[PDB]
Amino acid sequence: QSINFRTARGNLSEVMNNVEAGEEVEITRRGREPAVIASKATFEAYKKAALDAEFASLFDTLDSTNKELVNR
Amino acid sequence: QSINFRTARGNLSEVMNNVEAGEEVEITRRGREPAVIASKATFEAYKKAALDAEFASLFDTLDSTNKELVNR
Amino acid sequence: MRHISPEELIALHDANISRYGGLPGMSDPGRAEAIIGRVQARVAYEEITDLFEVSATYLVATARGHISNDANKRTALNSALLFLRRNGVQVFDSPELADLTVGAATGEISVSSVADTLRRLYGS
Amino acid sequence: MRHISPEELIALHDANISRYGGLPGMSDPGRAEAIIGRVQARVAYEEITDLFEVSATYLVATARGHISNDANKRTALNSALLFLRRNGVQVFDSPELADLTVGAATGEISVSSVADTLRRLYGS
Ligand SMILES: [Cl-]
């Protein structure tokens, strides 16, 4: 769930198998904000939810003109 | 965007600054399925959108009892 | 077994308030943490494997756990059935679910009786 | 400056056809790649820093880019305003957006005019 910079470097191949198994590991760092490792399938599934939501708001905001343009 | 787990091992500190800048890096392994490193900020936002959609369809499924419970 | 986290439980509660009604901005994360804590603790203590007994626990713990001043019964029912959905069990609305939740809150219906009702409805 | 990928432009088109109407399953990736390719190229060549010019480019490029035989004016408009929203500009519906988009698509309104109208509506 949370490992340090160094531990990842040395046990990266293990972090892969955890991630592949279904875990979402955080990578903390002494300097700046941290990062997260996840499997591509889950990441991309979350990215699509976000994009889908983004489109929903855009379409809600522009609902009238969107409806109108269908008939032009 | 796509790198092997060896180039990651040696250049982990580079991957961090890339990730924090705005990049979303894939990590491949030959014979295995890949992972993705990304900033915790963007990952969590994606996860949250996934979750919103998850609640929205449950609420849809149970829309009738939910409305009824408000008045009790 | 997939569970619901304290931060997910609050998010659910907040999301329900927005959609159906109630006073927003009040959800206590300590109550969310305490509600989930009970559910995990009960599972470990009684070594519960039955999804419907666990589902019943989310329902009773939440309906009596007062995350905030409103919408607790909804958050209870919804988290119960979200847990079932998350663990492969197909869920759907039923006229029984309102009374069931009210009974759990009032103490009139025990955790096992809730588990029985949920099993009858969604079991196989 | 945040941009829209080819793969997003397609997702946007399919999402729009589902919601508002049109023939689905017909979006050409090479067309999406060509539309974004043109926007990105114009930006570099002309060294465009103005967000509303870039928006206007997305709008004309997509409107005349023929991603499929349907909903190209809608994708054009939405893509342009998605760009704006993504770069921190607040957007909203306006009575003149429909006319704008149609004249864009037919060549009667050029990129600069579309830019001036977006800059008027959404730029301080
Ligand atoms: Cl309630």
From Swiss-Prot, chains A, B:
Alphabetized UniProt keyword annotations: Repressor, Toxin-antitoxin system, Transcription, Transcription regulation
GO CC list: protein-DNA complex
Keyword Repressor attached: yes
GO molecular function: DNA binding; DNA-binding transcription repressor activity; protein homodimerization activity; sequence-specific DNA binding; toxin sequestering activity
Region called Sufficient for antitoxin activity, its presence prevents formation of a doc-EF-Tu complex, residue ranges: 49-72
Effect of Y46A: Decreases repressor activity, binds DNA less well, inhibits doc normally
Modification after translation (UniProt): Degraded by the ClpXP protease.
Pfam families from the UniProt entry: PhdYeFM_antitox
InterPro entries: Antitoxin_Phd/YefM, YefM-like_sf
One record GO biological process: negative regulation of DNA-templated transcription
SUPFAM superfamilies with a match to the protein in the record: YefM-like
Effect recorded for K47M: Decreases repressor activity, binds DNA less well, inhibits doc normally
Taxonomic superkingdom: Viruses
Subunit and partners: Homodimer. Interacts with cognate toxin doc, the exact ratio of doc:phd varies from 1:1 to 1:3. Interaction with doc prevents both kinase activity and dephosphorylation of EF-Tu.
Role according to the record: Antitoxin component of a type II toxin-antitoxin (TA) system. A labile antitoxin that binds to cognate doc toxin and neutralizes its ability to phosphorylate host EF-Tu. Does not reverse phosphorylation. Bacteriophage P1 lysogenizes bacteria as a low-copy number plasmid; phd and doc proteins function in unison to stabilize plasmid number by inducing a lethal response to P1 plasmid prophage loss.
More details: The concentration of phd in P1 lysogens is far greater than that of the toxin it antagonizes. Such an excess may assure the well-being of carriers of the addicting plasmid.
Family: Belongs to the phD/YefM antitoxin family.
Record protein name field: Antitoxin phd
UniProtKB/Swiss-Prot annotation, chains C, D:
Domain (Fido) ranges: 4-120
GO molecular function: ATP binding; DNA binding; protein serine kinase activity; protein serine/threonine kinase activity
Top EC class of this enzyme: transferase
E.C. number(s) listed in UniProt: 2.7.11.1
Pfam families: Fic
Keyword Transcription regulation: yes
Record's keyword annotation contains Nuclease: no
Record Gene3D superfamilies: Fic/DOC protein, Fido domain
Annotated GO biological process: killing by virus of host cell by post-segregational killing; regulation of translation; symbiont-mediated suppression of host translation
Keyword field: ATP-binding, DNA-binding, Kinase, Nucleotide-binding, Repressor, Toxin-antitoxin system, Transcription, Transcription regulation, Transferase, Translation regulation
Effect of L82P: Loss of toxin and transcriptional regulatory activity
Outcome recorded upon mutating L118P: Loss of toxin and transcriptional regulatory activity
Catalytic activity: L-seryl-[protein] + ATP = O-phospho-L-seryl-[protein] + ADP + H(+); L-threonyl-[protein] + ATP = O-phospho-L-threonyl-[protein] + ADP + H(+)
Protein's job: Toxic component of a type II toxin-antitoxin (TA) system. Phosphorylates EF-Tu on 'Thr-383' in vitro; can use ATP or GTP. Also dephosphorylates in the presence of ADP or GDP. Can only phosphorylate before the ternary aminoacyl-tRNA EF-Tu-GTP complex is formed; interaction with cognate antitoxin phd prevents phosphorylation and dephosphorylation of EF-Tu. Overexpression results in inhibition of growth in liquid cultures and a decrease in colony formation by inhibiting translation, stabilizing mRNA and polysomes; these effects are overcome by concomitant expression of antitoxin phd. Antitoxin phd binds to its own promoter repressing its expression; toxin doc acts as a corepressor or derepressor depending on the ratio, repressing or inducing expression.
Listed NCBIfam families: DOC_P1
Subunit structure: Interacts with cognate antitoxin phd, the exact ratio of doc:phd varies from 1:1 to 1:3. Interaction with phd prevents kinase or phosphorylase activity on EF-Tu. Interacts with the 30S ribosomal subunit.
The protein's name in its UniProt record: Protein kinase doc
Species: Escherichia phage P1 (Bacteriophage P1)
